[PDB]
């Protein structure tokens, strides 16, 4: 049956049907248009009229324009032929490499795994990053979130994690660009074709790319995540493999939701967001998961608007994570990269029965001395360090070498650090710190532990300083 547009406001389009009303989520195709314009049915307004959301610009639409009911949600290609390709919200290829001939197609909307499909296996995923490896190890099959403010470190980190992890990965990965910088996809795409994780000739590619950058309208940015998500689900279930799913900024999925919620006729919730922020988010995050049928190690970059971690968006994101890496501008401004907050990043894997007592005991040693140094910062700012006991000065000193020894030069950032990248092993990181704590290096200067790999390179740099 034929539906007709009866109203258009930005990205919300009301379509009235005279016969056969399209159910919610059903994807309607707008007629009379140059490129495919999909509307997603969001609600039944009554009077045979449905309110939808456009997956692309709605410029040019005219009331009375015909809209077709595809009879199903937004279905995208899933399968091995997606690998090495770049697709948009609605699964159309955008890498100028022609149709994506997959057998199966998949709806980008699906129910999350049931409670009986849940996995309880915890097994660390060492990353080579001392701060993450140490204080809040990532977990294979786990949900890693990387919170960070504008320009703090999310991207570079996700990139390093793709370097230090993805490459040494035996399986398929899915990178979902959501509301970020298009030239970044550009960067990523060409960095992958280089390293070879993407192959344009032989069919050996291992990465599937879904993109809906900050140039896209709210409806897209609001669903791209589900698309990348859906492409990851195929690899997990319909193939039972270990799937890596990177998503640079899932916060954009929520932000986008707010733009359209406005137009949908919803009274706004706290801070202007939509009422459905929590649920909307749940029905998505819950699909990003490991089941008994397969695994998904997801790494999600999370933007903190106005650097406010209490903002409904990020706030609401923590409960969905198995591991959190909180980046701080204050730390970044002291030139500590990655600007990871030693005292606000967590991992369900930070358990002695899981990473050992030596690992756990050092981790807590570090979060204790830094915590104790942090509580002294009040006194240091007013009365300097001449008003601290002899004991205090000692911790302050070890904290400062620990803080710096937490930094690390990543390959993906060599241009800004002016140092060759470093990949530190786990034992080496445990060791390095056990030592700084035990006072073993209380004779070396702070600046010696800054921007270095293992502890050994902390010493080398010390001699050079003489």
């Amino acid at each position: 049956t034929t539906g007709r547009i009866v109203a258009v406001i930005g990205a919300v389009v009301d379509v009235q049907f005279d016969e056969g009303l399209p159910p919610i989520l059903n994807a309607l195709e707008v007629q009379g248009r140059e490129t495919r314009l999909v509307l997603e049915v969001a609600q039944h307004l009554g009077e045979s009229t449905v309110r939808t959301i456009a997956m692309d610009g709605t410029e040019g639409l005219v009331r009375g324009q015909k809209v077709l009911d595809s009879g199903a949600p937004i279905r995208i290609p899933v399968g091995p032929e997606t690998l090495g390709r770049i697709m948009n919200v609605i699964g159309e290829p955008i890498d100028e490499r022609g149709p994506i001939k997959t057998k199966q197609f998949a709806a980008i909307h699906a129910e999350a795994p049931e409670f009986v499909e849940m996995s309880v296996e915890q097994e660390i995923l060492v990353t080579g990053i001392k701060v993450v490896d140490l204080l809040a190890p990532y977990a294979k099959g786990g949900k890693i979130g990387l919170f960070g403010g504008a320009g703090v470190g999310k991207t570079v980190l996700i990139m390093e994690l793709i370097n230090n992890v993805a490459k040494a990965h035996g399986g398929y990965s899915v990178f979902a660009g959501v509301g970020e910088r298009t030239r970044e996809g550009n960067d990523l795409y060409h960095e992958m074709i280089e390293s070879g994780v993407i192959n344009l000739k032989d069919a050996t590619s291992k990465v599937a790319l879904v993109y809906g950058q900050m140039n896209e309208p709210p409806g897209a940015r609001a669903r791209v995540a589900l698309t990348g998500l859906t492409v990851a689900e195929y690899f997990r279930d319909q193939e039972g493999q270990d799937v890596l799913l990177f998503i640079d900024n899932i916060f954009r999925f929520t932000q986008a939701g707010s733009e359209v919620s406005a137009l949908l006729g919803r009274i706004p919730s706290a801070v202007g967001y939509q009422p459905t922020l929590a649920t909307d988010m749940g029905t998505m995050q819950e699909r990003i998961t490991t089941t008994k049928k397969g695994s998904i190690t997801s790494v999600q970059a999370i933007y903190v608007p106005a650097d406010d971690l209490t903002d409904p968006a990020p706030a609401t994101t923590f409960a969905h994570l198995d591991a959190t890496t909180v980046l701080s501008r204050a730390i970044a401004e002291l030139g500590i990269y990655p600007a990871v907050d030693p005292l606000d990043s967590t991992s369900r894997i930070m358990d002695p029965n899981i990473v050992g007592s030596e690992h756990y005991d050092v981790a807590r040693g570090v979060q204790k001395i830094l915590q104790d140094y942090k509580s002294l910062q009040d006194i240091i700012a007013i009365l300097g360090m001449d008003e601290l006991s002899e004991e205090d000065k000692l911790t302050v000193s070890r904290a400062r070498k620990i803080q710096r020894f937490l930094s690390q030069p990543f390959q993906v950032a060599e241009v800004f650090t002016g140092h060759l990248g470093k990949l530190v092993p786990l034992k080496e990181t445990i060791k390095g710190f056990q030592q700084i704590l035990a006072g073993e290096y209380d004779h070396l200067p702070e600046q010696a532990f800054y921007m270095v790999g293992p502890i050994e390179e902390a010493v080398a740099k010390a001699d050079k300083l003489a």
């Binding site: 109203a7 009331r63 504008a150 320009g151 993109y211 900050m214």
Partner: protein, 479 residues
């Protein structure tokens, strides 16, 4: 006739409710009686909401409304150079009609992933601090953020004025057409701006889109987009452009007025949920095309005004989370005499390195480091030698206004500070030394500068000679 026409049902709040126009397209330009123009924003069952591009007090209930049958677009082309127009493209410099023969929608979506390539061509601002510590690349976006009266607008003007040395060349691949959008500023400043540009002989390769404090919100809301389309013209046709949205901070509060007026739910700092999309879509249009798409580009230096240096504010962080770097201008540095007041330690150029000339890379590569060591330590012969370099290099990055340097002269002046031919000199003089040293090299050494301008590199041959030129100058320098 209600298929291509309509009467105004109501006019108030800034949005005009039109009856009819059964055939209008969303985002379509429409014309009122008074000649004023609008855009179809909201298509509803019984009416059409029209954003009015101008004084909406001139619209009255009953007024006839007509379809132009077109999605909002604006004149585009080389004929716009040396001209001053309003958001809609209407010339406003008295100089008469525009010889424009092409048009382009202001809302065109930006290039996708495929057609791009990492910036790689220099976007020489002529500004020492910038072109050495925060190197911009053609096709990149570099936010210019700082408080009121910090020097933001200069960073940009000196940049436009710098291009002249290129456009008066022969090779179209090194020229840089410029576009300066004026949003929310005072007419006088614009007036004072082009007049300045004229004197520097810059306006000929410059377009100036203006939507000042007197212009209705929508106009200001729009301006940046129109200037972009014009910039895109050069981009997509193999040419290079540089558009300056002099503070989007004001395009944001202008949008906020329409949002709050259209009753869209207030969020952080009362802004709408889309104040980010507003800036992300616009700025995504600035880019560096690869050879299979013309190889041209569009560099955008947007400006953001912070409140008391609070870069964590809502808008400031949005744009920051869009652009490829920020040039932080500190108020304290300004009133302290450091001009340009570029807080180096905070500023960045996430993509300008590859684009930086090999010339700078050499000297400036070591300078970012020496300023690193200095920023840290700021007795003992070790650190004493670091503080000495620091206060000298710092005075080097000091620069005047309206006088952009040439990339080769920079490496020359910088070359001094890095190798150490300033250690023994005293601070208070380093600037007096500069003006003297630079005017000296320019005059008595066009060759060396020319070989560097031409090799974009300070070869071992150019280096040895540049060492001479500096050593045998210190001698004849009058403290």
């Amino acid at each position: 006739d209600l298929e291509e026409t309509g009467r105004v049902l109501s006019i108030g709040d800034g949005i005009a409710r039109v009856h009819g126009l059964r055939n209008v397209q969303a985002e379509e330009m429409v014309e009122f009686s008074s000649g004023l123009k609008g855009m179809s924003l909201n298509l509803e069952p019984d009416n059409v909401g029209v954003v009015v591009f101008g004084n909406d007090k001139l619209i009255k209930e009953g007024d006839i409304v007509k379809r132009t049958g077109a999605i909002v677009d604006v004149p585009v082309g080389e004929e716009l150079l040396g001209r001053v127009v309003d958001a809609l493209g209407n010339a406003i410099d008295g100089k008469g009609p525009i010889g424009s023969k092409a048009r382009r929608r202001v809302g065109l979506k930006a290039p996708g992933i495929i057609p791009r390539i990492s910036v790689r061509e220099p976007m020489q601002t002529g500004i020492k601090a910038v072109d050495s510590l925060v190197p911009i690349g053609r096709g990149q976006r570099e936010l210019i953020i700082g408080d009121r009266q910090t020097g933001k607008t200069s960073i940009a003007i000196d940049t436009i004025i710098n291009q002249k040395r290129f456009n008066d060349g022969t090779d179209e691949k090194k020229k840089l057409y410029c576009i300066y959008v004026a949003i929310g500023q005072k007419r006088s400043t614009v007036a004072q701006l082009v007049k300045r540009l004229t004197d520097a002989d810059a306006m000929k390769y410059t377009i100036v889109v203006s939507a000042t404090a007197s212009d209705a919100a929508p106009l200001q809301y729009l301006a940046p987009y129109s200037g972009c389309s014009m910039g895109e013209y050069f981009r997509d046709n193999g040419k290079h452009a540089l558009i300056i949205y002099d503070d989007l901070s004001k395009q944001a509060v202008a949008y906020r007025q329409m949002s709050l007026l259209l009753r869209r739910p207030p969020g952080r700092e009362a802004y709408p949920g889309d104040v980010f999309y507003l800036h992300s879509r616009l700025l995504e249009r600035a880019a560096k095309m690869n050879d299979a798409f013309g190889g041209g580009s569009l560099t955008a230096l947007p400006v953001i005004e912070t409140q008391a240096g609070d870069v964590s504010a809502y808008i400031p962080t949005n744009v920051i989370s869009i652009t490829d770097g920020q040039i932080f201008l500190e108020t304290e540095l300004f009133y302290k005499g450091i001009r340009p007041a570029i807080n180096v330690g905070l500023s960045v150029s996430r993509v300008g390195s590859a684009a930086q000339t090999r010339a700078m890379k050499q000297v400036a590569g070591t300078m970012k480091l020496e300023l690193a060591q200095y920023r840290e330590v700021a007795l003992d012969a070790a650190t004493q030698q670091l503080l000495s370099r620091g206060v000298r290099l710092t005075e080097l990055l000091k620069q005047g206004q309206y006088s952009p340097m040439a990339i080769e002269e920079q490496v020359a002046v910088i070359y001094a500070g890095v190798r150490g031919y300033l250690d023994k000199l005293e601070p208070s003089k380093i600037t007096k030394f500069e003006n003297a040293f630079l005017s000296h090299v320019i005059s008595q050494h066009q060759a060396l500068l020319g070989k560097i301008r031409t090799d974009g590199k300070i070869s071992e041959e150019s280096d040895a000679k540049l060492k001479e030129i500096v050593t045998n100058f210190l001698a004849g320098f009058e403290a």
